[PDB]
Each structure stands twice: as structure tokens, then as C-alpha cells.
Design a protein around this ligand. Structure first.
Ligand SMILES: O=C(NCCO)c1ccc2c(c1)C(=O)c1ccc(Nc3cc(NC(=O)c4cccs4)c(F)cc3F)cc1CC2
Ligand SMILES: CCCCCCCCO[C@@H]1O[C@H](CO)[C@@H](O)[C@H](O)[C@H]1O
Ligand SMILES: CCCCCCCCO[C@@H]1O[C@H](CO)[C@@H](O)[C@H](O)[C@H]1O
Length: 328
């Protein structure tokens, strides 16, 4: 059992093992793991077991992180608690690789080279194939959720502000496809290529307005998957927007880029390219290796439909902390 030491950070006492030094806020903190020589990120959970909803989300997060073992997905390096028993088990800390920046801090409103864009988006997609294969969707993919290196190695965070969001999430559709994350990728890719936000809506309705201007009004196939006739009649009522030509916004882009984007930013989520399909697109020829794009082991999400007592969630979480084996 390690020896801990306490300290004030983010307006609260953090008790962590000796090995982790130089905690600096980023609630998350950067640190240096002196035992393994890694810069790491330490997340202290916000009141993990005050309520049943808190306790389940604590458990969800730990279950997800213990499962993910992929180079482009944030994985778990340690999980600890200063408590010596379940009885006094009240705090949870999760440790991961510290990447250093996010895709915002990187791009910095500048335009990236096409090669650089390929490598970044390929990594995103490679990571999404993995997580999608475990039947997990991100739901909120965006630049500040993509942690990146000085070397540009990328890892996705917080899987399972409204600029990268699929139009159906925004409209409370409720039966999401994994291609909601593909919409977000399209938004990210286009921003990397031009230096600007593709859809910088001022609010909810302006966002949907800017989308429709680019992608045009919903088609006939799409309309017949919409139940509400009032929703339908409002739509067919609007000015009839043709889909825009993807060249005009992306002038001088690799035409393979424009092709992939056309396949990603399709209103109809059923008609969007999937992560695995996108990896095999020609835009990625220089990075694509079909035998190094792995899928996940199947992930038991049977706890999601359970309604249990707070002490049950808290105990399940305690068990997973106690069974944790650091990776190699
Ligand atoms: O080094 C940095 N700042 C120093 C000041 O310049 C820095 C700046 C930005 C970023 C990181 C590091 C960085 O590497 C980083 C690392 C982890 C992180 N979030 C984070 C997220 C999670 N959990 C999750 O992502 C998931 C929960 C559920 C499924 S995934 C976690 F368990 C621990 C974490 F630390 C956010 C970030 C944010 C991006
Ligand atoms: C003005 C914006 C119109 C948005 C139309 C988005 C259509 C989203 O696509 C819909 O996604 C649903 C699940 O999310 C699927 O069940 C539907 O089959 C699919 O058509
Ligand atoms: C800017 C106004 C756009 C409104 C479009 C709303 C239509 C989405 O309505 C969605 O239709 C689905 C399939 O019929 C239903 O299952 C969902 O409950 C509903 O959210």
C-alpha cells in the first residue's frame, strides 16, 4: 500500500500516492509519475457517491476507462483512493497519460497542411472504430476532447460547444447512430483545413440554419423518416436550398478531402460513412493499414439498464479499484 500526502488544489484537499509529484491544475492536474517516469493527468472525481446518479456515473467512467486499450483512445494507468476500507471509501482518482494540449491549443486558428490533417483525422477515426466496435458512442466529439502531443499523437477523451454537434442530437431525436461522431469529425476536419469554424451558430437555431445552408434542405428519403407532419410542413415550407458545392468553401483542398467530407456531413445519419469505411478511403492511403486498426473486446454494458442502490454502485466501484492491474 503506497504512502500518500495531502495538499490544497482546486479548492480541495487531494490525498495521492508519493510517486506522483508536481501536480499542476489543468478537476484534472498534470503530474509526474516518478515511479514510471511519465507525465500523467490525475482526475479527482467530484463527490463520487453523494447520489445514485453520481455513483453510477463514477462507476460508468471507471468501467469505460478500464476497458479501453487503444493508442488513440485515452486509457487508464492507475486508479487509487486514500481509503483503507469500503466503509470509509469516499474519494476516487483516475490517472492517464498526459498529452500536453488539445486540438484547440494546436490548430490555434491556423490552417494545417493536408498531410497533417490526414494524420490527425486518421487517428481520430482509428480511435472511433475501436470505441464504436464496443458499442459506445462519444456523442460530443470536439477539439477540446482530443488530446494531442508535440509529436501530434492523438487520444480521444470523454466518450460515453455546440459547433461540432450532430443535428439530430441538437433536435433531441433520441435514437442515435454511431455516425453522430462522424458528423463531428467532418466539422473538425473542415476546420483544420480552413482555419475557421465550419458552423459557428450564434445559438441553437442559427446552428441548424448554417448547417442547412451548406448541406441544403432535407431530401425526400429523409422526410419520410420524420413522423411529425408539423415538423415536415415547416421544412417543406422553407426556401428550397440546394446542397452547396463542397469546392466553394474548400477552394484548393485535396479533392480526396472534399470527397470524404461530402460523405461525412450528410444530414441523414443512416447515409453517412462509418469510421471503418472512412479509414479505407483514399484520402488516408499513406497511413492506412487494415491489419493495425483494431476493434475492442466486447464491453459489458449490462449495468446500464440496472437501477441499484447507492451503496451497491459504491461497492461495485470499490471492487473495480481493488482489482485494477496497471498495464505493461
Ligand atoms: O499539459 C497540459 N496542460 C499543462 C499546462 O499547459 C494539458 C493541456 C490540455 C490537455 C492535457 C494536458 C491533457 O493531456 C489532458 C489529459 C486528460 C484529460 N482528461 C481526463 C479525462 C478522463 N476521463 C475520460 O476521458 C473519460 C471518461 C469516461 C470515458 S473517457 C480522465 F479519466 C482523466 C483525465 F485527465 C484532459 C486533458 C486536457 C487536454
Ligand atoms: C434540420 C436538421 C434535420 C436533421 C435531420 C437529421 C436526420 C438524422 O438522421 C436520422 O437519425 C436517426 C437517429 O439519430 C435515425 O434513426 C434516422 O433514420 C436518420 O434519418
Ligand atoms: C428547425 C426545426 C427542425 C425540426 C425537425 C424535428 C423532427 C425530428 O423529430 C424526431 O422525429 C423522429 C422520427 O420521426 C422521432 O422519433 C423523434 O421522436 C423526434 O425527435
Amino acid at each position: 500500500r503506497p504512502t500518500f500526502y495531502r495538499q490544497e488544489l482546486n479548492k480541495t484537499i487531494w490525498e495521492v500516492p508519493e510517486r506522483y509529484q508536481n501536480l499542476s491544475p489543468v478537476s484534472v492536474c498534470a503530474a509526474f509519475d516518478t515511479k514510471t517516469g511519465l507525465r500523467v493527468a490525475v482526475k479527482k472525481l467530484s463527490r463520487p457517491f453523494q447520489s445514485i446518479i453520481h455513483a453510477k456515473r463514477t462507476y460508468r467512467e471507471l468501467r469505460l476507462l478500464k476497458h479501453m486499450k487503444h493508442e488513440n483512445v485515452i486509457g487508464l494507468l492507475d486508479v487509487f483512493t486514500p481509503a483503507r476500507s469500503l466503509e470509509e471509501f469516499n474519494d476516487v482518482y483516475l490517472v492517464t497519460h498526459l498529452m500536453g494540449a488539445d486540438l484547440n491549443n494546436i490548430v490555434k486558428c491556423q490552417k494545417l497542411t493536408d498531410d497533417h490533417v490526414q494524420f490527425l483525422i486518421y487517428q481520430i477515426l482509428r480511435g472511433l472504430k475501436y470505441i464504436h466496435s464496443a458499442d459506445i458512442i462519444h456523442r460530443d466529439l470536439k477539439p477540446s476532447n482530443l488530446a494531442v502531443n508535440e509529436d501530434c499523437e492523438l487520444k480521444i477523451l470523454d466518450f460515453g460547444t455546440r459547433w461540432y454537434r450532430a443535428p439530430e442530437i441538437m433536435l433531441n431525436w433520441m435514437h442515435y447512430n454511431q455516425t453522430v461522431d462522424i458528423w463531428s469529425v467532418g466539422c473538425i476536419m473542415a476546420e483544420l483545413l480552413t482555419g475557421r469554424t465550419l458552423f459557428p451558430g450564434t445559438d441553437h437555431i442559427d446552428q441548424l440554419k448554417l448547417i442547412l445552408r451548406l448541406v441544403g434542405t432535407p431530401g425526400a428519403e429523409l422526410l419520410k423518416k420524420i413522423s411529425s407532419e408539423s415538423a415536415r410542413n415547416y421544412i417543406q415550407s422553407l426556401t428550397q436550398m440546394p446542397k452547396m458545392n463542397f469546392a466553394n468553401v474548400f477552394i484548393g483542398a485535396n479533392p480526396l478531402a472534399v470527397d470524404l467530407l461530402e460523405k461525412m456531413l450528410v444530414l441523414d445519419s443512416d447515409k453517412r460513412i462509418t469510421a471503418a469505411q472512412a479509414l479505407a478511403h483514399a484520402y488516408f492511403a499513406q497511413y492506412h493499414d487494415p491489419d493495425d486498426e483494431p476493434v475492442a473486446d466486447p464491453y459489458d454494458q449490462s449495468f446500464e439498464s440496472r437501477d441499484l442502490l447507492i451503496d451497491e454502485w459504491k461497492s461495485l466501484t470499490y471492487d473495480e479499484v481493488i482489482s485494477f492491474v496497471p498495464p505493461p
